[PDB]
Amino acid sequence: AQCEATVESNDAMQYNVKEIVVDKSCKQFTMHLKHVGKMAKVAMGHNLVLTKDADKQAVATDGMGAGLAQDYVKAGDTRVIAHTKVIGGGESDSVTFDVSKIAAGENYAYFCSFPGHWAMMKGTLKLGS
Numbered sequence: 001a002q003c004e005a006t007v008e009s010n011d012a013m014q015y016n017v018k019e020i021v022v023d024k025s026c027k028q029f030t031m032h033l034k035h036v037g038k039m040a041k042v043a044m045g046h047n048l049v050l051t052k053d054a055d056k057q058a059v060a061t062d063g064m065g066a067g068l069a070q071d072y073v074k075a076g077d078t079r080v081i082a083h084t085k086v087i088g089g090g091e092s093d094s095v096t097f098d099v100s101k102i103a104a105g106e107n108y109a110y111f112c113s114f115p116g117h118w119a120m121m122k123g124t125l126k127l128g129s
């Protein structure tokens with residue numbers, strides 16, 4: 001609703017939403033992440049990272065080497081448009097980004113960069129109205 005969406009992540013390594021559509025009327029957009037499971041962040045942590053589809057694996061790979069304290073996102077990664085921190089069960093986080101950083105027709109991927117999670121936790125985001 002509005003210029004925001006909510007994605008729930010669980011203990012089975014899956015997002016509940018696979019597609020997010022950003023309305024052209026939005027200048028800013030907010031992504032809310034809820035970890036609805038009950039596992040600790042050191043075992044089942046989840047975040048939400050947004051990049052072009054092409055940068056997915058490169059960003060996830062560098063992110064794994066950043067560490068948990070860095071939310072598994074390489075500090076100042078120029079390929080990451082937006083990202084939340086890594087959360088454990090019972091928690092949540094939000095990230096707001098400038099819609100101008102998004103282009104029509106372009107393909108964007110949101111995925112979890114916690115080690116090994118990217119291959120199963122990913123979705124598509126695009127500008128469309």
Ligand SMILES: [Cu+2]
Nearest residue numbers: 045046112117
């Ligand atoms: Cu995850």
